[PDB]
Amino acid sequence: ASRLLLNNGAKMPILGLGTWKSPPGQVTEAVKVAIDVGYRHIDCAHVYQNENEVGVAIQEKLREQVVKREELFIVSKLWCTYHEKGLVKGACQKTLSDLKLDYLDLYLIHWPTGFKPGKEFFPLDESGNVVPSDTNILDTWAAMEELVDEGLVKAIGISNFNHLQVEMILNKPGLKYKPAVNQIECHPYLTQEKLIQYCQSKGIVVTAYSPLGSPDRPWAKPEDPSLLEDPRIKAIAAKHNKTTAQVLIRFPMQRNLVVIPKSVTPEAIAENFKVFDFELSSQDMTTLLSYNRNWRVCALLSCTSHKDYPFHEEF
């Protein structure tokens, strides 16, 4: 149970190294260390602006022969300003060039929301409002399918899509390729039970990001213990001779989810990998599931009036 089978027949490692919020000056060393520790799935995106530095690490370790490229599962994401049908291919080719790779194992639509094309990641009004694209989700999906046909990516998928937006793609006339994964926010305060039940029933693998939530909770007093120091979670950790971070990474894994932890320190990278030698019990799982408050941290609030804004729906 350290890889999950995708609908293209490939196996995706259930633990991924995130490069989100890893600075370019540090990320090459972070990825090298990760591959030495045993990470094989690495999660990138153009908007992180560090893909070139990730690429240096990968082909250093490929030269050293500690890993072969067919053992690596590399994913990247199409940013919102490239949703136009004519631009998707070049966005993909730029990422491949940065990563110094021939193909990606998976390529995700980052958000369902398309922005006006250009150099800016968030194109703006004279009043500072994000300017939408007029593009359809189905049009940019057509362009993503072409990437699989041309052999540039092995599978395509989506990120932060609600179930109605998934159904829209599943009902595309002449659909060639179904989404292989939907990458979503998932942690004890937002357990996403409905959306993951929907996805898994359609054969779509769910990847959790931000599995520890955010430290800044709107209901909590500054003296209230965090998730990592919560007494009941500490008790579960003590029971298994594990850290509380390790318990919270294992939590999604046992729901048959892929998990991308925040991996911004060398300590976290080493700690987060030690999650394969234990299993949480039924009682542990019910306890961890009971923290849900449907609290969403990554809500992309700047785009609430966008027609394809995902989070007005319940799931």
Report d(CA 262, CA 100) in Å as an integer.
Answer: 24
Residue indicated by tokens 């990847």: 207
Q: Quote the tokens at residue 82.
A: 């490239």
Give the domain CATH number at 189: 3.20.20.100
Report d(CA 299, CA 303) in Å as an integer.
Answer: 9
Q: What is the 3-state secondary structure (H, E, C) of the chain?
A: CCEEECCCCCEEECEEEECCCCCHHHHHHHHHHHHHHCCCEEECCHHHCCHHHHHHHHHHHHHCCCCCCCCCEEEEEECHHHCCCCCHHHHHHHHHHHHCCCCECEEEECCCCCECCCCCCCCECCCCCECECCCCHHHHHHHHHHHHHCCCECCEEEECCCHHHHHHHHCCCCCCCCCCEEEEECECCECCHHHHHHHHHCCCEEEEECCCCCCCCCCCCCCCCCHHHCHHHHHHHHHHCCCHHHHHHHHHHCCCCEEECCCCCHHHHHHHHCCCCCCCCHHHHHHHHCCCCCCCCCCCHHHCCCCCCHHHCCC
Report d(CA 108, CA 118) in Å as an integer.
Answer: 20
The tally of domains found in the chain comes to 1
Report d(CA 30, CA 19) in Å as an integer.
Answer: 9
Question: Residues 118, 120, 123, 128: is their CA dihedral positive or negative?
Answer: negative
Query: Which one-letter DSSP state was computed for residue 117?
Result: -
The alpha carbon of residue 211 and the mean position of all alpha carbons in its chain are separated, in whole angstroms, by 11
**Angle made by CA atoms 306, 308, 310, in degrees to the nearest 5:** 105
Which residues are marked as active site? 48
Residue indicated by tokens 């926010």: 185
Resolution in A: 2.1
Report d(CA 192, CA 51) in Å as an integer.
Answer: 29
Range of the domain at 243: 1-315
Contact between 239 and 247 (Cβ < 8 Å): no
Contact between 107 and 158 (Cβ < 8 Å): no
Q: Quote the tokens at residue 228.
A: 């990592």
The alpha carbon of residue 311 and the mean position of all alpha carbons in its chain are separated, in whole angstroms, by 17
Contact between 171 and 146 (Cβ < 8 Å): no
Contact between 261 and 212 (Cβ < 8 Å): yes
For every residue of 235-252, DSSP letters joined together read: HHHHHHT--HHHHHHHHH
**Angle made by CA atoms 286, 290, 215, in degrees to the nearest 5:** 125
Query: Which one-letter DSSP state was computed for residue 204?
Result: P
Query: Which one-letter DSSP state was computed for residue 311?
Result: G
Contact between 81 and 91 (Cβ < 8 Å): no
